[PDB]
Amino acid sequence: IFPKQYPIINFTTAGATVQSYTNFIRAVRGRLTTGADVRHEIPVLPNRVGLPINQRFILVELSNHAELSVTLALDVTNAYVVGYRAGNSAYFFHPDNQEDAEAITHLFTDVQNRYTFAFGGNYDRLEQLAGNLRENIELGNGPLEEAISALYYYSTGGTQLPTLARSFIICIQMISEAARFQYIEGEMRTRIRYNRRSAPDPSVITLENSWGRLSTAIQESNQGAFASPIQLQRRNGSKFSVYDVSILIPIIALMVYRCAPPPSSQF
Numbered sequence: 001i002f003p004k005q006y007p008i009i010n011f012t013t014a015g016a017t018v019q020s021y022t023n024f025i026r027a028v029r030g031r032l033t034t035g036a037d038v039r040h041e042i043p044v045l046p047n048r049v050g051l052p053i054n055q056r057f058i059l060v061e062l063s064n065h066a067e068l069s070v071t072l073a074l075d076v077t078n079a080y081v082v083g084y085r086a087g088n089s090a091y092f093f094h095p096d097n098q099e100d101a102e103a104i105t106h107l108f109t110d111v112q113n114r115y116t117f118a119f120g121g122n123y124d125r126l127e128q129l130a131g132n133l134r135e136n137i138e139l140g141n142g143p144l145e146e147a148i149s150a151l152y153y154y155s156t157g158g159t160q161l162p163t164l165a166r167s168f169i170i171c172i173q174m175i176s177e178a179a180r181f182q183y184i185e186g187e188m189r190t191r192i193r194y195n196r197r198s199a200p201d202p203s204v205i206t207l208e209n210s211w212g213r214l215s216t217a218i219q220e221s222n223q224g225a226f227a228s229p230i231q232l233q234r235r236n237g238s239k240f241s242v243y244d245v246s247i248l249i250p251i252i253a254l255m256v257y258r259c260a261p262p263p264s265s266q267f
C-alpha cells in the first residue's frame, strides 16, 4: 500500500436519489474543510503552504449504472479536479506550477499508465476543447451518468476530446461546485428529484466565476460588511449587489484560504 491511502468517497448514479446525493456532498465537504478555521460562520479550506502531501488530496470514486468506475482526484485546498483514474490508466491536467506538479506525482501511484494532458483543467480551456460553453451543457444524474462513461472509455479508444472535456465540466460542477456552494447543490438536487437534465442558468454560472472573489471579500470584510459591493447574477441574468456576508451564509459553503486566520477566534 502507498503510505496512507487518501480518503476515498464513493458515489453511484445507478439508483441516485435526492437523499443519496445529499449524503455524497456532505462527505465531500466534510473531507475538505479542516473543521476549524471558520470566517463568519463559513468554513475555510486549508492553506496549501503548510499542507503535507499526505493531507493534500481526496479521491472521489464514481461508479456507473453499467459497472464502470472513475476515481477523481480533488485538491483539498480548492476542490479542484486535478486528474482521474480509469481501470489501469491515470490522467492529470497540466499543472500551473512546479509545486502542484510535485504533488501530482503522488496520485494513483499504483497505476500502470500515467498521462499528463498538455492542456489545463480550468473551465476556459475545457470549454474551448468541448466546443461548448457551460451554459449549453446539461447537468443532472443523466449527464453525470454519461460523463463517467466517457471518462472511462477515454482509456479504451472511445476518446473524442470534446466529449472528454465536456464530461469533465459536467463532473466538476456536480461535485466540486456543489460542495463549494449549498446553492449549486440545490440546483442539482432539484434536477434529480424530477429526473431532469438542464444547463446551468446565469445565477449558477456567476457563483462559479466568483467563488474566489467572494472568499477574499468575506475574509477581508469589516466584521461582516464587504469593503465593496460584489455584483452577482440572478436566474434571469439580472444583476444585484451584495453588501453583507449574511445574505451569502445560506448560499456559499466553502471558501478558499486567503487572509491568515485573524486573532484565531474559535471556541
Ligand SMILES: Nc1nc2c(c(=O)[nH]1)CC=N2
Binding pocket: 078, 079, 080, 081, 082, 121, 122, 123, 172, 176, 177
Ligand atoms: N479542474 C477544475 N476543477 C474545478 C474547477 C475548474 O475550473 N477546473 C472549478 C472547480 N473545480
